[PDB]
Structure formats: C-alpha cells, structure tokens
Amino acid sequence: HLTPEEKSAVTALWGKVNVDEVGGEALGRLLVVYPWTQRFFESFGDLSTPDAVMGNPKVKAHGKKVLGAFSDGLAHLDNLKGTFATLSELHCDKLHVDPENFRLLGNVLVCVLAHHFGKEFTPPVQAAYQKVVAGVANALAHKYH
Amino acid sequence: HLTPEEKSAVTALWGKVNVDEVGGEALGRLLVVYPWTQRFFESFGDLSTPDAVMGNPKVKAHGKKVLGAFSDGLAHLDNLKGTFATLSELHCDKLHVDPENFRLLGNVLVCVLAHHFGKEFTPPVQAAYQKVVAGVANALAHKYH
Amino acid sequence: VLSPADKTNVKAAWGKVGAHAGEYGAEALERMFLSFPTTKTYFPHFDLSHGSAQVKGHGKKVADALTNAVAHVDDMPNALSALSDLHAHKLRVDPVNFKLLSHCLLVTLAAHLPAEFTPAVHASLDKFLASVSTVLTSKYR
Amino acid sequence: VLSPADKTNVKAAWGKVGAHAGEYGAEALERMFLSFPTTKTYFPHFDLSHGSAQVKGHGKKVADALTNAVAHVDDMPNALSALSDLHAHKLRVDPVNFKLLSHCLLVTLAAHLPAEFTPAVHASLDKFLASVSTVLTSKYR
Numbered sequence: 001h002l003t004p005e006e007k008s009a010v011t012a013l014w015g016k017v018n019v020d021e022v023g024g025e026a027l028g029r030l031l032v033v034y035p036w037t038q039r040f041f042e043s044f045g046d047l048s049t050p051d052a053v054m055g056n057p058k059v060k061a062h063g064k065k066v067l068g069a070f071s072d073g074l075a076h077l078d079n080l081k082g083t084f085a086t087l088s089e090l091h092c093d094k095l096h097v098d099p100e101n102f103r104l105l106g107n108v109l110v111c112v113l114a115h116h117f118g119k120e121f122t123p124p125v126q127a128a129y130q131k132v133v134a135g136v137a138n139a140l141a142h143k144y145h
Numbered sequence: 146h147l148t149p150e151e152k153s154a155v156t157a158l159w160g161k162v163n164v165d166e167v168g169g170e171a172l173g174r175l176l177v178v179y180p181w182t183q184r185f186f187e188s189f190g191d192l193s194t195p196d197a198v199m200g201n202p203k204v205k206a207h208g209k210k211v212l213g214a215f216s217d218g219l220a221h222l223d224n225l226k227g228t229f230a231t232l233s234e235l236h237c238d239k240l241h242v243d244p245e246n247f248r249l250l251g252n253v254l255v256c257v258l259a260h261h262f263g264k265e266f267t268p269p270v271q272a273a274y275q276k277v278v279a280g281v282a283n284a285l286a287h288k289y290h
Numbered sequence: 291v292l293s294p295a296d297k298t299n300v301k302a303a304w305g306k307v308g309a310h311a312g313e314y315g316a317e318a319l320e321r322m323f324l325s326f327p328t329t330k331t332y333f334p335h336f337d338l339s340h341g342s343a344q345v346k347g348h349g350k351k352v353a354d355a356l357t358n359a360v361a362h363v364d365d366m367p368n369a370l371s372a373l374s375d376l377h378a379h380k381l382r383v384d385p386v387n388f389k390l391l392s393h394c395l396l397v398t399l400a401a402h403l404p405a406e407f408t409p410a411v412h413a414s415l416d417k418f419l420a421s422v423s424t425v426l427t428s429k430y431r
Numbered sequence: 432v433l434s435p436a437d438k439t440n441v442k443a444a445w446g447k448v449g450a451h452a453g454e455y456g457a458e459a460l461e462r463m464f465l466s467f468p469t470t471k472t473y474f475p476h477f478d479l480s481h482g483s484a485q486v487k488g489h490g491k492k493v494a495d496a497l498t499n500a501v502a503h504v505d506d507m508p509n510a511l512s513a514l515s516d517l518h519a520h521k522l523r524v525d526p527v528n529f530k531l532l533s534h535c536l537l538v539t540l541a542a543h544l545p546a547e548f549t550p551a552v553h554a555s556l557d558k559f560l561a562s563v564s565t566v567l568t569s570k571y572r
C-alpha cells in the first residue's frame with residue numbers, strides 16, 4: 001500500500017525510464033554484484049567478467065523482458081499480487097527461482113535509478129521505489145509452495 | 146495463510162502450554178541468545194550471566210506479559226493485524242522496539258516449544274507455528290511509521 | 291566469534307547427537323522444506339517426500355559436515371574448504387537460506403536433546419551454525 | 432575477503448567522494464529513515480526531519496568512520512574496535528539494520544558518482560560495506 005504522492009513520484013520518474021536500457025543494466029548488475037545469481041543463466045553465454053556480463057546480448061534481452069513485466073506492474077500498484085500471480089507460479093514451478101533474488105534485483109534496480117538519475121532520485125522518491133520493489137518481490141513470491 | 150488443520154494443530158498444542166513458564170523461558174532465552182535485545186531492560190536488574198537472566202523475576206514478569214498477549218492473539222488468527230494494531234502503535238511510538246525483535250522472539254519461541262514438547266513438535270506442527278510467529282511479527286510491525 | 295566456552299558447549303551437545311547424525315540432518319531438512327517452502331527451489335531434482343532416500347542421504351552429508359566442523363572448530367575455513375568451493379561456485383544457494391536451515395537444525399537439536407539444550411548451549415549452537423554458515427558463504431564473491 | 436581490485440575500487444570511489452563524505456553520510460541516513468522507517472527506532476531522541484543538524488552531525492561521524500575504514504582497509508577490525516564495542520554493548524542496533532544503511536550508502540554514492548559507480552565498483556563497495564558491517568557486529572555475542 002503506497003500513498004498517493006508516492007504513486008505519483010513513481011509514475012513521474014518512470015516516464016523517463018528507458019525500460020530496455022535500465023532492464024539490461026539492472027539484470028547485468030545483479031549478475032555482477034551477486035554472482036551466485038548467475039546460476040539461473042547457465043545458457044546465457046559469456047558471464048566471466050563485468051564487461052562480458054554487461055555487454056552480453058542475452059543478458060540485455062532478458063533484462064528488457066523482466067523490467068518490461070515490472071513496468072506493466074506499475075499500472076497496477078494496488079494489486080501487485082493478482083498482477084504477478086502467473087509469473088509467480090512460473091518462477092516457482094518451472095524456473096525454481098528462490099524469491100530472495102527478487103529482493104536483490106529490487107535493490108540493484110534502485111541503485112541503477114540513483115546512478116542514472118542522480119540528484120533527481122531524491123530520498124522521498126527512493127522511499128517510494130523501495131515500497132514498489134518490496135511489493136513486486138512480495139507479489140512474485142506469493143504463489144510459491 | 147494457515148490451513149484449517151494448521152489452526153487446530155496450533156490450538157491443540159497451545160492448550161498444553163504454561164504461558165507464564167514458556168513466556169519467561171522464551172524472553173530469557175532471547176536476552177541470552179541475542180544479548181543486544183537487553184537494550185530495553187536496563188531497569189530489570191541482574192542480566193550478567195545466563196543463569197541471572199533466566200532467574201531474574203522481572204525478565205520472567207515481562208515474559209509472562211508478552212506471551213500472555215501472544216496467547217490472547219491466538220484467538221484471532223484471522224485478524225492478527227487488527228488484534229495487534231494498538232500494541233504495534235505502542236511499540237513504535239513509545240517503546241521504540243525495532244520489529245526485528247519480534248522475529249527473533251518468534252524463533253526463540255519455536256526453539257522453546259520444540260524443547261518443551263520434543264517429538265510432539267513435529268515438522269508439520271513447526272511449519273504451522275512458523276506461520277503464526279511470522280504473522281504476529283508482521284502484525285506488530287504493521288503500524289510502524 | 292566462537293569462544294572456548296562455545297567450543298565446549300558445541301562439542302558436548304553434538305557429541306550426544308552421535309549415531310543419530312544422519313537422522314537429525316534428514317529431520318532438519320524436512321523441517322526446512324515444510325517451514326520455508328522457498329528452500330525447495332534448491333532441490334527440484336529430489337524426491338522431497340517424507341522418508342525419501344535422497345533426503346536421508348543428504349541429511350547424512352550435512353550432519354557429517356557439521357561433525358567435521360565440530361572436530362575442527364579451531365580451523366573451520368580449512369576443514370570446510372571444499373564445501374565452501376562447492377556452495378560458492380556450483381550450488382550457489384542464496385545466503386539467506388543458511389539462516390533457515392540453521393534455525394531448523396537448532397529446532398531439531400532442541401526436540402531431541404532436552405537435557406543438553408540449556409539457554410547457554412542454545413546460544414553456543416546458534417553461534418556455531420552461524421559460523422559454519424559464514425564459512426560456507428566465504429567465497430561467494 | 433576484499434580483493435586487491437576491491438580495495439582499489441573502494442579507495443577510488445571514496446577518493447572522489449573526498450570532502451563531501453560528511454554530506455553523503457547525512458544523505459544516506461535520511462534515505463534510510465525514509466525508506467526503512469523501523470530504523471528510526473534507534474533515534475527517538477533526534478529530530479529526524481530533512482536538514483536536521485543531529486542527522487548531519489551523525490552523518491559526519493558515520494562518514495569519518497568509513498574514511499577511517501578505507502584508510503585501514505587491511506586492518507579494519509582494529510580501526511573499528513571502539514565502534515564495534517559501542518554498537519555491541521550500548522547502542523545494540525539489531526544487525527539487520529546495517530544492511531539497510533549499507534544499501535542507502537550505496538544509493539547515495541550511485542547518486543553522486545556518475546563516472547565512478549561502474550558495475551565493478553558497485554560490486555566492490557557493497558562488499559566493503561558488508562565487511563564494515565560484519566566488523567561492526569562482530570562483538571554482539
């Protein structure tokens with residue numbers, strides 16, 4: 001449950017997000033900063049160095065897909081559970097992804113937005129995004145069993 | 146999200162609990178196993194050793210009070226947030242208790258039930274009590290601001 | 291972080307485990323999968339049903355690694371070096387899961403060793419599992 | 432452990448921070464209080480509003496500890512010893528909170544270091560803050 005003014009800080013900032021670029025950037029950083037997360041991307045080609053990870057086209061491609069789904073979710077901030085239920089089931093039953101990874105990606109994304117937007121990524125804007133990324137991860141965790 | 150069988154499992158075991166003994170035991174072990182939780186209990190006298198902490202009547206007294214309220218909340222497993230709202234406000238606004246302390250005490254309580262009940266604290270009984278201690282911790286954290 | 295008194299406490303308590311090691315390991319893992327279902331994401335290859343031979347065998351490997359850790363409590367990084375590598379480079383289990391299994395090992399010991407699980411032994415075992423956990427995640431990055 | 436590359440990465444990042452360390456300390460605390468309200472429970476005595484001199488003063492102390500940590504990166508336990516006593520035995524901040532402030536320090540650095548906050552540097556800094564955190568809680572029990 002985000003407050004109205006937190007909804008509109010989220011909305012305003014996202015209007016400027018190149019979803020493809022940021023997605024590629026955040027997934028790449030995940031895999032660099034928390035390298036055990038590479039366990040899910042065995043088929044992805046070269047992940048041996050930061051530069052290889054960041055320029056990997058499959059990392060970039062998948063990063064666009066992930067953040068695209070995140071993006072869609074920002075239109076349904078009042079029902080993150082219902083919105084992500086099917087991807088939640090997919091991530092549990094087919095992909096076997098420990099939902100803790102959603103939390104780590106949440107925090108990398110926050111760092112990317114801060115790095116990319118600089119001083120515009122104010123402490124109130126950050127706070128609103130923290131609530132978003134916890135909500136998303138929670139919603140993606142929700143159908144695990 | 147407790148199942149109907151999980152609730153009656155929880156209720157069944159709790160009917161066997163001496164709240165005041167189990168409370169003093171769990172709060173005592175909290176202060177022993179995680180000594181930083183002692184920060185709230187400067188007024189309580191002797192906490193110098195495990196035996197002194199376990200023996201301290203103020204520790205026991207506070208234990209009785211917390212687990213009493215915990216106990217009373219097991220009558221409202223479908224409204225832990227509601228039941229615990231005003232105490233949440235109190236622990237945030239006046240007591241300044243970091244909700245992490247609720248999680249630590251929750252897992253201490255699980256250790257104590259396991260010790261106290263042995264064999265009877267089966268893996269499915271534990272799973273039901275974990276949902277309980279999660280729910281109560283979340284509920285007591287809910288009005289923090 | 292492990293004091294001499296912790297080391298005495300752990301050896302005492304875990305010495306009592308003895309020949310139950312296998313069994314207690316299996317029980318901890320089952321407690322873990324039922325209490326914390328996300329942990330199962332690390333075992334989609336296993337029959338995780340109650341009594342499965344895969345879980346009993348794994349239980350025994352975990353218990354024996356713990357016995358090894360206890361028998362070399364002074365030099366845990368070294369004694370667990372291979373296991374460290376395996377979890378860092380291949381298994382790659384998120385570090386939060388070690389807390390979940392540690393807590394389940396603690397519950398198991400509690401339900402099985404009522405004379406030994408005093409508050410001080412409880413604190414010692416918790417520190418011990420946290421220390422083995424830190425060792426097993428030492429080389430993650 | 433912090434690699435030679437991490438040590439190099441940390442020093443160059445903190446190097447560019449330079450005289451703004453204090454300011455950034457204060458910003459990171461503000462970010463933490465707003466992002467993670469439970470952290471406020473450690474500060475019922477402070478006015479936590481934006482611009483608060485108590486937050487600015489505390490932020491400057493936090494940043495100077497980090498500057499000190501960077502300058503003794505091979506010897507952090509000792510450099511931080513007084514601070515690890517103070518957190519273990521007086522302040523008694525739950526260890527979960529160090530992860531919150533680390534994240535918020537990382538965010539503040541990201542927001543001020545457009546050239547320097549590369550993926551590798553971001554990786555080294557997180558390691559370095561985890562490490563400071565570990566040292567700071569190493570005397571808790």
Ligand code: HEM
Binds near residue numbers: 065067101102140
């Ligand atoms: C922000 C939260 C996340 C969202 C919204 C998300 C969304 C998605 C989407 C939309 C797909 C493609 C579905 C399809 O194949 O039909 C996908 C696949 C996948 N995701 Fe997630 N994801 C998230 C986080 C993560 C994280 C953190 C990881 C692991 C570190 C992960 C691991 C995977 C894997 C392994 C696949 C399959 C890739 C392949 O086809 O090889 N996801 N995700």
Ligand code: HEM
Binds near residue numbers: 182210232250285
């Ligand atoms: C199971 C979770 C808990 C419940 C249900 C609970 C419940 C209560 C209740 C009913 C009171 C009485 C307040 C009053 O008289 O108005 C109280 C007070 C208090 N609680 Fe909590 N508590 C819990 C956990 C904790 C934890 C883990 C701590 C810290 C380690 C803590 C610290 C305190 C303190 C310092 C007081 C004031 C005591 C006094 O004035 O003597 N509580 N709690």
Ligand code: HEM
Binds near residue numbers: 332356
């Ligand atoms: C107390 C801490 C732990 C200890 C001492 C430990 C020890 C071990 C040992 C001895 C093995 C077998 C290695 C071999 O065959 O050579 C193993 C494998 C494995 N562990 Fe860890 N482990 C711990 C924590 C965890 C955690 C928390 C998880 C995830 C929830 C995990 C997941 C796995 C998996 C998936 C394997 C491979 C199992 C197989 O397919 O046979 N471990 N561990």
Ligand code: HEM
Binds near residue numbers: 470496
């Ligand atoms: C990067 C990790 C941290 C560092 C380097 C750090 C460093 C410091 C320093 C240098 C001081 C001043 C000590 C003195 O006056 O001699 C301090 C005090 C304090 N810290 Fe920590 N700290 C950290 C994390 C935390 C966290 C996570 C919290 C809780 C959210 C916390 C709560 C406090 C409090 C309440 C004080 C006393 C403030 C006052 O009343 O003046 N600290 N810390």
Ligand SMILES: CC(C)(Oc1ccc(NC(=O)Nc2cc(Cl)cc(Cl)c2)cc1)C(=O)O
Binds near residue numbers: 428431531561
């Ligand atoms: C073994 C190793 C490398 O594991 C890890 C190190 C760091 C992290 N990151 C975090 O948890 N971030 C994090 C950030 C926030 Cl805002 C909240 C919380 Cl609750 C956690 C995860 C695992 C270690 O501990 O050094």
Ligand SMILES: CC(C)(Oc1ccc(NC(=O)Nc2cc(Cl)cc(Cl)c2)cc1)C(=O)O
Binds near residue numbers: 390527571
């Ligand atoms: C510095 C010191 C002493 O701090 C601590 C050590 C251990 C713990 N215990 C836990 O986290 N248990 C725990 C149990 C469960 Cl079910 C889930 C989770 Cl998420 C955590 C807390 C703090 C250390 O890290 O050794």
